[PDB]
């Protein structure tokens with residue numbers, strides 16, 4: 181479904197970021213679009229890439245030069261650990277910084293509220309409020325619950341992304 | 346060349362482990378042997394792999410694939426005094442595994458560039474390396490940022506297989 185709408189001749193660049201241990205690597209792997217490749221453009225800055233035909237997913241941790249990899253980004257996936265209540269405030273701050281990058285002003289926002297399987301995970305209502313998504317203007321956004329370990333939610337989120345480019 | 350020595354017909358499997366943040370991914374990248382590939386064979390277990398001709402490095406974090414292993418590289422953060430005991434415990438666990446009794450051991454005392462780093466004698470001591478019998482081992486200081494020490498360590502590894 182989403183694969184159909186994303187594939188083509190023109191490069192499709194997706195940025196997936198979030199705090200460490202949000203589940204970003206696990207998501208890449210569960211997509212099955214090919215090998216996860218790690219590069220280190222500078223020491224301490226680990227970048228994971230999955231490239232399949234015209235589609236690129238670029239992943240790194242935030243909250244710990246970036247502007248280079250923002251070129252022609254069409255979507256931001258922001259992954260949050262729904263169970264990490266102590267760092268939701270940090271996640272909000274890093275998301276908002278991403279969102280005032282002019283280079284990516286026309287990128288749509290998909291939020292994965294990940295680790296939905298966990299007994300004290302925040303609800304999608306809670307995650308949406310605490311990330312301040314309602315405050316977003318002039319950008320399409322969606323927040324989608326996910327479990328990156330069984331893959332629940334991932335295709336639903338990507339389907340929305342593909343439909344709204 | 347440490348590379349030319351490892352090269353040949355016979356498979357050469359190296360296992361590189363250590364605590365998270367020890368410097369293992371940085372070391373792999375510095376080796377320039379090929380793309381680093383991540384797999385997740387089981388939930389929560391991230392494995393990084395570099396394969397070049399007959400040589401494969403397999404990397405994962407311990408703390409917090411043993412068949413035909415010719416060498417174990419253990420990477421320790423020389424500047425992390427609070428966790429070297431945990432590094433010792435995980436190293437000793439691995440060296441007790443039957444499947445790998447025949448593997449030689451290279452220890453990289455990494456992050457040697459940092460001004461407060463433990464000296465090699467102290468790393469050696471706090472890892473209990475001297476207590477290891479019936480295994481060839483070597484401790485080498487390294488800096489993964491600029492490659493200091495890496496070639497020296499790998500050359501010892503290639504020589505002593």
Ligand SMILES: Nc1nc2c(ncn2[C@@H]2O[C@H](COP(=O)(O)OP(=O)(O)O)[C@@H](O)[C@H]2O)c(=O)[nH]1
Pocket residue numbers: 198199200201202203204205206207294295296297298326327328329388389390391
């Ligand atoms: N329970 C649960 N654990 C998850 C989920 N997604 C990731 N994890 C675990 O959280 C840890 C961090 O995952 P990882 O993908 O490496 O996060 P990254 O640092 O953002 O790339 C790993 O142990 C994962 O197995 C999830 O949806 N549910």
Ligand SMILES: Nc1nc2c(ncn2[C@@H]2O[C@H](COP(=O)(O)OP(=O)(O)O)[C@@H](O)[C@H]2O)c(=O)[nH]1
Pocket residue numbers: 223224225226363364365366367368369370371372455456457458459487488489490
């Ligand atoms: N100062 C210094 N920092 C290092 C060295 N090796 C790695 N690092 C840093 O330590 C952190 C963790 O290294 P990484 O390769 O990701 O460790 P891994 O978790 O064992 O794969 C990164 O911020 C690196 O920049 C080193 O030799 N010296």
Ligand SMILES: [Mg+2]
Pocket residue numbers: 201204205206
């Ligand atoms: Mg990751």
Ligand SMILES: [Mg+2]
Pocket residue numbers: 366369370371
């Ligand atoms: Mg690593």
